[PDB]
Amino acid sequence: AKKILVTCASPYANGSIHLGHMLEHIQADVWVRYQRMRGHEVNFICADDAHGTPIMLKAQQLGITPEQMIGEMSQEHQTDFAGFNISYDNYHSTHSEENRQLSELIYSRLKENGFIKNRTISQLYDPEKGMFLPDRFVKGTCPKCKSPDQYGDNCEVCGATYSPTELIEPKSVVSGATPVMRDSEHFFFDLPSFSEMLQAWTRSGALQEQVANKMQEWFESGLQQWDISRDAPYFGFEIPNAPGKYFYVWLDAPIGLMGSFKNLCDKRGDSVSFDEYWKKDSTAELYHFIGKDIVYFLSLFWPAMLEGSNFRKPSNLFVHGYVTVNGAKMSKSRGTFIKASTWLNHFDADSLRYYYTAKLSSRIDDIDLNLEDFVQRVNADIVNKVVNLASRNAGFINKRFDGVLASELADPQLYKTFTDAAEVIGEAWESREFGKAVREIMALADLANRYVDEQAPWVVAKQEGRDADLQAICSMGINLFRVLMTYLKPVLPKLTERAEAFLNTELTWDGIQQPLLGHKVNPFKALYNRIDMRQVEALVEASK
Numbered sequence: 001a002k003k004i005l006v007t008c009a010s011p012y013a014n015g016s017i018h019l020g021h022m023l024e025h026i027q028a029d030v031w032v033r034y035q036r037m038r039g040h041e042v043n044f045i046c047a048d049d050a051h052g053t054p055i056m057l058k059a060q061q062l063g064i065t066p067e068q069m070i071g072e073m074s075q076e077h078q079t080d081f082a083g084f085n086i087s088y089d090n091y092h093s094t095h096s097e098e099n100r101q102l103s104e105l106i107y108s109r110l111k112e113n114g115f116i117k118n119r120t121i122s123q124l125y126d127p128e129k130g131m132f133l134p135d136r137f138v139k140g141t142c143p144k145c146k147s148p149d150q151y152g153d154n155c156e157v158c159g160a161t162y163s164p165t166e167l168i169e170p171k172s173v174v175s176g177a178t179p180v181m182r183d184s185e186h187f188f189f190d191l192p193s194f195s196e197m198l199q200a201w202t203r204s205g206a207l208q209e210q211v212a213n214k215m216q217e218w219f220e221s222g223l224q225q226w227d228i229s230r231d232a233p234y235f236g237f238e239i240p241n242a243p244g245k246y247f248y249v250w251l252d253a254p255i256g257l258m259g260s261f262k263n264l265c266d267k268r269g270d271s272v273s274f275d276e277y278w279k280k281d282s283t284a285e286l287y288h289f290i291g292k293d294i295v296y297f298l299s300l301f302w303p304a305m306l307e308g309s310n311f312r313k314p315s316n317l318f319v320h321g322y323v324t325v326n327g328a329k330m331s332k333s334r335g336t337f338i339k340a341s342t343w344l345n346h347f348d349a350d351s352l353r354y355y356y357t358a359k360l361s362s363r364i365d366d367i368d369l370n371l372e373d374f375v376q377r378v379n380a381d382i383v384n385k386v387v388n389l390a391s392r393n394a395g396f397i398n399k400r401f402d403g404v405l406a407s408e409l410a411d412p413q414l415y416k417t418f419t420d421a422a423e424v425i426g427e428a429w430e431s432r433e434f435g436k437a438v439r440e441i442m443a444l445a446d447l448a449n450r451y452v453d454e455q456a457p458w459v460v461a462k463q464e465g466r467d468a469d470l471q472a473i474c475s476m477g478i479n480l481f482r483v484l485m486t487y488l489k490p491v492l493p494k495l496t497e498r499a500e501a502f503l504n505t506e507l508t509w510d511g512i513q514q515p516l517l518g519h520k521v522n523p524f525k526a527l528y529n530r531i532d533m534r535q536v537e538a539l540v541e542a543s544k
């Protein structure tokens with residue numbers, strides 16, 4: 001009965017989707033699919049973050065328009081996400097008419113309300129190319145150790161940190177020309193004006209404890225005005241009444257999520273939902289799934305921007321940690337920097353979805369993809385615990401009972417134990433305690449396989465006159481499978497479809513209350529195959 005708008009952070013246009021992105025999008029998709037299973041109105045929204053100096057320069061180097069480049073990158077991203085069955089209701093772009101109009105609108109309102117300030121700043125400028133240079137586009141000699149060709153505000157040889165203005169014999173990364181300091185008028189958003197409001201939100205208890213603690217650190221350091229303008233040349237939205245000035249990509253980026261929803265409503269011919277979800281008096285819920293590196297933008301700048309422009313603010317922020325492979329940050333040299341597209345050439349989407357889900361919690365701690373454990377866990381849990389319940393029992397039903405399940409449950413008590421667990425498992429999905437949900441589900445799977453072993457169908461099947469017993473035992477196992485697959489439906493989309501085809505029924509959350517009796521099931525190839533380390537080794541080699 002709830003109206004929920006859920007978003008995932010917008011992937012940067014100039015970068016292929018990797019395992020890190022997948023952790024975020026999979027976490028959100030699992031939650032979204034569960035919400036849909038409970039009958040709520042859900043709108044899963046995302047978009048490609050396509051503006052900025054890096055993108056502008058990349059396009060120039062490739063000899064194509066930025067529009068063409070971001071378009072191709074967007075399609076690549078969507079192909080990968082579709083491959084992992086991320087169920088977005090809309091995937092738009094921050095470079096859109098919807099975002100242009102909403103960004104101009106919000107800026108206008110913020111300015112009218114007195115939250116925009118003008119101040120001149122001094123910044124390194126490339127006089128040859130004719131453009132201001134972001135820190136990483138300035139290279140030179142470290143002022144401390146004198147090591148050459150160091151980029152931005154830090155030296156990769158001695159570890160020193162400094163302003164790029166301290167680099168010796170500075171050079172433009174773009175043209176090689178010597179940059180010089182140049183003045184420029186910039187527009188600033190008065191974030192400090194929203195300090196009390198933001199502090200109240202931080203202590204409200206809605207945000208994750210770890211996030212609230214980090215925010216207190218930021219309040220202690222002190223909030224500062226935010227530089228939201230960038231000079232031409234730039235690829236983005238030009239600021240109204242300010243020729244040659246553009247909105248910094250980070251200002252328009254989150255607005256792009258609002259833009260993606262407007263685009264969805266407009267395509268649907270829905271003239272009421274946008275305001276119903278974004279107006280101050282909205283009763284709809286708004287959630288953002290994000291990573292630790294952008295919490296400052298989404299927890300401070302964003303809510304303040306919305307408040308200052310008369311829009312509702314996030315109901316909550318769901319933050320996840322970094323992804324590690326084999327315990328460490330992804331390493332290109334070790335072949336652990338894995339792209340989503342590469343992953344799919346070696347394994348299916350469900351395997352990664354399951355593994356991440358089994359490790360995820362409501363905290364922001366890092367998630368580790370240990371490849372050896374990946375093979376062991378997928379084979380042990382999916383193939384040997386869950387799918388086993390169907391694969392060990394379906395054959396007998398199809399070959400000896402014409403594919404028809406027993407007329408009654410052989411062990412009603414055991415079945416109730418399984419259906420009684422729906423409350424706790426659903427609450428775990430709801431609270432984002434994915435690890436807890438999976439542990440509860442696998443505990444049930446253990447009891448199910450214990451039941452089959454206690455009945456020993458491989459023994460019953462060879463004994464004279466025990467046909468009824470065999471059908472009863474195998475049908476019972478298949479019904480336990482039905483329940484487990486329902487609980488795992490948000491996690492394993494493809495296996496679920498194969499399971500529903502086998503069971504001749506769509507799996508619904510409430511449906512488990514009525515077991516399948518005197519019901520016809522269909523035969524199947526292999527619901528899920530084992531994986532091995534040879535495949536992992538191939539994945540790693542292909543990623544080097």
Ligand SMILES: [Zn+2]
Pocket residue numbers: 142143144145146147155156157158159160
């Ligand atoms: Zn140095």
